[PDB]
Amino acid sequence: KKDKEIIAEYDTQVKEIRAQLTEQMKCLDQQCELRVQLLQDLQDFFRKKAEIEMDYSRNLEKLAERFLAKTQNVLSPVNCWNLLLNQVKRESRDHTTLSDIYLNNIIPRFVQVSEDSGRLFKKSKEVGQQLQDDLMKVLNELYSVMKTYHMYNADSISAQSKLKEAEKQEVKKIEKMKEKRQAKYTENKLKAIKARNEYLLALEATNASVFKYYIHDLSDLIDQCCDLGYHASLNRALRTFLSAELNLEQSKHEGLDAIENAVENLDATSDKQRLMEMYNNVFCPPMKFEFQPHMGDMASQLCAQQPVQSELVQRCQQLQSRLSTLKIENEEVKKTMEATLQTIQDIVTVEDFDVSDCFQYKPSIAKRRANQQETEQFYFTKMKEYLEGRNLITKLQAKHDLLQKTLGES
Amino acid sequence: KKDKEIIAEYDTQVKEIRAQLTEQMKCLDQQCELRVQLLQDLQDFFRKKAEIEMDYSRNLEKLAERFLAKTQNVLSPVNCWNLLLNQVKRESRDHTTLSDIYLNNIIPRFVQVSEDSGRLFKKSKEVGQQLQDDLMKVLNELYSVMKTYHMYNADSISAQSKLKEAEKQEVKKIEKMKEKRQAKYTENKLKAIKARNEYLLALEATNASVFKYYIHDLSDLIDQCCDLGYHASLNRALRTFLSAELNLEQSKHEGLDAIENAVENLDATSDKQRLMEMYNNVFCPPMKFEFQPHMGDMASQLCAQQPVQSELVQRCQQLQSRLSTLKIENEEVKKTMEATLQTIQDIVTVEDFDVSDCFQYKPSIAKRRANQQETEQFYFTKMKEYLEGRNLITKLQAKHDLLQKTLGES
Secondary structure: OOHHHHHHHHHHHHHHHHHHHHHHHHHHHHHHHHHHHHHHHHHHHHHHHHHHHHHHHHHHHHHHHHHHOOOOOOOHHHHHHHHHHHHHHHHHHHHHHHHHHHHHHHHHHHHHHHHHHHHHHHHHHHHHHHHHHHHHHHHHHHHHHHHHHHHHHHHHHHHHHHHHHHHHOOOOHHHHHHHHHHHHHHHHHHHHHHHHHHHHHHHHHHHHHHHHHHHHHHHHHHHHHHHOOHHHHHHHHHHHHHHHHHHHHHHHHHHHHHHHHHHHOOOHHHHHHHHHOOOHHHHOOOOOOOOOOOOOOOOOOOOOOOOOHHHHHHHHHHHHHHHHHHHHHHHHHHHHHHHHHHHHHHHHOOOOOOOHHHHOOOOOHHHHHHHHHHHHHHHHHHHHHHHHHHHHHHHHHHHHHHHHHHHOOO | OOHHHHHHHHHHHHHHHHHHHHHHHHHHHHHHHHHHHHHHHHHHHHHHHHHHHHHHHHHHHHHHHHHHOOOOOOOHHHHHHHHHHHHHHHHHHHHHHHHHHHHHHHHHHHHHHHHHHHHHHHHHHHHHHHHHHHHHHHHHHHHHHHHHHHHHHHHHHHHHHHHHHHHHOOOOHHHHHHHHHHHHHHHHHHHHHHHHHHHHHHHHHHHHHHHHHHHHHHHHHHHHHHHOOHHHHHHHHHHHHHHHHHHHHHHHHHHHHHHHHHHHOOOHHHHHHHHHOOOHHHHOOOOOOOOOOOOOOOOOOOOOOOOOHHHHHHHHHHHHHHHHHHHHHHHHHHHHHHHHHHHHHHHHOOOOOOOHHHHOOOOOHHHHHHHHHHHHHHHHHHHHHHHHHHHHHHHHHHHHHHHHHHHOOO
C-alpha cells in the first residue's frame, strides 16, 4: 500500500465530505425559500379573502337595507320576516369584522414572520458557514500530519536498511563508521514514533470533529428556523383565523335561533285576536233590537190567549218537526266539512323541510296539487251548504224557543 | 213615541250594521293584500339571496383554484395550508347548494302559497258575501213586520175610541149599530195581537241571526286564510331555510376542525426527521478515518516508550488543565444562550389569538419588536462563541482521552 495511494483514498473521502457539506447548504437554502413562498401565499390568500368577505358583506347589507326601506301589534309572519332581515344585517356586520381581522391582524403577522425568516436565515447561514469552515480546517490539518509521518517513516526504513549492511561489512575503522549509523537510526526511529503518535492523535481529533457535526451540530442547525418562532408564530396566526371563524358561527347561531323561535310562534288565533283588538269599532257586536211599543202598549210578551193558543201550538209543533230533521241533515254536512278540512291540514303539514340530503357528497307533485285544489273546492261547497242550513236553523230555533217558553209541553 | 220616530231609530241601527259589514269586507281584503305583498317580498329576498350566495361561492371557488394551481412527506405547515384550501373549496360547494335550495325548493313554495292565497280569498269573499246578504235579509224582513204591527195597532186604537162613543150614545136601533162596533173591535184587537206576536218572534230571529254572525260566523271567516295552510306552508318554507343553514354550519365545522387538528400537529422535530429521511444521502455520517499504515507498519497504537513517556505525561496533564478551565467557561456561555433562547420562546408563544372582542357590539408593539430583534441578535452572538468554544474542547478532549487510556494516572 503506497504513499500516493494512501493519500488519494483520503483525498476522495475529503472531497466526498466537501461535496456533502455544499449539498446541506443548498438544502437549507431551498427550505428557507419554501418557508418564504408559503408566507407569501398565506398573505395573498388572506388579502383576496378579506376582499371576498367584504363584497359578500356589502351585498348582504344592501339586500337587508332594500327590504327594510320597503317599510301596531305585529302578526306572527311579519315578525319572522323582521327577524330574517335582522339575521342578514347581522351576517353583514360579521363579515365586515372578518375583513378587518384578516387585514389588521392576521396579515400583519404573516408579514412579520416573513421579514424574520429572512433575517434569521442570514444569521443561520453564518452559523452554517462557521461550522463548515471549522470542519474543513480539521480535515485539511490531517493531510500534513499524515505526510510528516509518511516522511519520518521513509527515513526510519532507509536507515535500518543501511544498518543491515553496516553489520554485514563487519577492520577497526569500519566499526567507528557503523556506530554512527546506529546513532542515526536511534535518532530516526524515535522521529518515526513521535510523528506516528501525532497522527494517531490527529485521527482521534478528526473523527471526533466529524461526528459532532454530523450527529449534533447539523441537527441543531436544521431546527434553528422553527426553534426561533416560525411554528409558534404560524400557530398564533391560524388560531386567530379559527378564533374569528368560531365567533361568526356563534353570532350566526344566535341569529338563526331568533328565526326558529318566531317560526315556532306562527299562530293564527293570536293573530286573529290581535286583528280584532286593533280595530274594535269594526268587530264589536251591536245593541240587540228591543221591542218598540206603539202608542204606549201595555203588554210586551207573547199573548197566548184564546183562540190563538191552538194556532201557536200548531206552529210550535211544526217548527220542532223541521228543526229535528234539518239539524240531523246539517250535522251530516258539518261532519263532511270537518273531515274535508282535516284532509287539507294533512297535506299542508307534511314534514318536507329537512334538506340534508342536498349537502351529501318527481313530477307527481302536480298530481297531488290538483287533488289538493279539488279538495279545497269541495270543502267550500260543503261550507256554503252548511252555512245556508245553519242560518235557517238559527231563526227557527229562535222562534220555536220563544213559543215553547210561553206554552209549555204537557 | 211616534211611528216614524220608532222606524227612524231602527233605520239608523241598520245603517250602522250595513256600514260595519262593509268595513269588515275592506279589512279582510286589506289583510289578503298584506299576505300577498309578504310572499312577494319573501320571493324577491330569496331570489336576490340565491344570487348573492352564488357570487360568494364563485369567488371562493376561484380563490382556492388559484392556490391549488400554484402547486414526498408533507411538512406540518404545508399540511395546514392544504387543509385551509380544502375548507375554502368546501364552503364554495356549500353555498352553491344553498343557491339550488333557495331556487329549486324554497321559492317554488312561496309561489305556490301566493297562487293559493289569491284563489282562496275569492272563495272566502264569496262566503263573506253570502253571510252578509243573509244578515241583510233578516234585518230588512223586520221593517215590514214592524209596520204590519204598527198598522193593526192604529186600527185597534181607533176602533176602541169609537166604541167609547158607541156606549156614551146609549133608542132601539142605536143598540143594533153599536153591537157591530164590538164586532169590529173584537176583530181588530185580535189582528193587533196576531201582528204583535209576529214582531216579538221577528225580534227573536233578528237578534239570534245578528249574534251568530258577530260571535261565530265573523270569527270563522277571519281565520279561513291561515286555517287552509298559510301558516303551515310558511312554517315548512322557513324550516327549509333553517335546515339549509344548519347543514352549512355543520359542514363548515367539520372543515375548520381539520384545520385545528393540523395546527395542533405543527411540529418542528417531526418535520426535521421527515427532512432527513427524504434526503438520506445528504445527512448520513461518513466512514470514520482509519489509521493507514505506511510500508506495512507493525504497531498502530500510541507508543509510550522511553523517553517519550515523560513528554506524553506533560502533554496529557496540560491538556487536562485547559479542558477543565475551558469547559467551565463554555458551560457559562451555554447557560446564557439557553436563557436567551427561552426569552425568545416566551415572546413568540404569547396567546394573542382570540379575537372575540371584535364581534362585541397600541404602538408599543414596535418597542417590543425591537427588543425581540436585539434578543435574537444577542442569542446568535453567544451561539457563535459557544460553538467556537465547543469545537476546541472537542479536539482537546479527543486527544487527551487517547493519552489517558495509554498512560493511566497513578
